Write a protein that binds this ligand. Structure first.
Ligand code: GNP
Ligand code: MG
Length: 171
C-alpha cells in the first residue's frame, strides 16, 4: 500500500515530448523512435517523498487536434495537469492561452497546473526565450520548469516536486 495516490495528466501540442517525458520518468529510458500518441496512454509509478509512498497514476494524452475532445474527458479526474510546450517551437508556446481556457472548462477547480518547457538539450535552437516563458508563467501564477526527456534534465524533479506539493495539498 501507498500513503498517497495522485492522478497526473500530461497535455500540450502534438510533438512537444509528453510521451518521451512520461516514459523517461516511468521507465528510466528515453524511448527511441517514439511515434504520435493515439488517444490516451496510461502509466504508473510509485515514488518515495520523504518516506511517504506516493503512487502516481499518469495519463499521457494525444496532442493531435483530432483526439482533442477525448483527451479533454480525462481532465476532471486529475489532481494535477502537466502542461507542456517545446522550447524550439513557438506555436506550441503561443497555443498555451487556449490550453488554459480548456483546463478552465474541463478540469476540476481544485486542479494544480504546472508548465513544462521541454527539449532544453536544444537550448540554442529555442524560439521562446527563458525570460518570455518565465514572464508568461509569473502572469499565470504557475510553476515553470525546463526539461529534457532526451538527456534527463529535470525529468525526475518534475514529478517528485509535484508529488511533494500534492502531499502538502492533501493535508
Ligand atoms: N531533442 C529532444 N527531442 C525530444 C525530447 N522529448 C521528445 N523529443 C522528440 O520530439 C518528438 C516528439 O516526442 P513525443 O514524446 O512523441 O511528443 P508528444 O508530445 O507525446 N506527441 P503526441 O501528442 O503526438 O503524442 C519525438 O521525435 C521525440 O524524440 C527532448 O527532450 N529532446
Ligand atoms: Mg505522445
Amino acid at each position: 500500500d501507498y500513503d498517497f495516490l495522485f492522478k497526473i495528466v500530461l497535455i500540450g501540442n502534438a510533438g512537444v515530448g509528453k510521451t518521451c517525458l512520461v516514459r523517461r520518468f516511468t521507465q528510466g529510458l528515453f524511448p527511441p523512435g517514439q511515434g504520435a500518441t493515439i488517444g490516451v496512454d496510461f502509466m504508473i509509478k510509485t515514488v518515495e517523498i520523504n518516506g511517504e509512498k506516493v503512487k502516481l497514476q499518469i495519463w499521457d494524452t494525444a496532442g493531435q487536434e483530432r483526439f482533442r475532445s477525448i483527451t479533454q474527458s480525462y481532465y476532471r479526474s486529475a489532481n494535477a495537469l502537466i502542461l507542456t510546450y517545446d522550447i524550439t517551437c513557438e506555436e506550441s508556446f503561443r497555443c498555451l492561452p487556449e490550453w488554459l481556457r480548456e483546463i478552465e472548462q474541463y478540469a476540476s477547480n481544485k486542479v494544480i497546473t504546472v508548465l513544462v518547457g521541454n527539449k532544453i538539450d536544444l537550448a540554442e535552437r529555442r524560439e521562446v526565450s527563458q525570460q518570455r516563458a518565465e514572464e508568461f508563467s509569473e502572469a499565470q501564477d504557475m510553476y515553470y520548469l525546463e526539461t529534457s526527456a532526451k538527456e534527463s534534465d529535470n525529468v525526475e524533479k518534475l514529478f517528485l516536486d509535484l508529488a511533494c506539493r500534492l502531499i502538502s495539498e492533501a493535508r
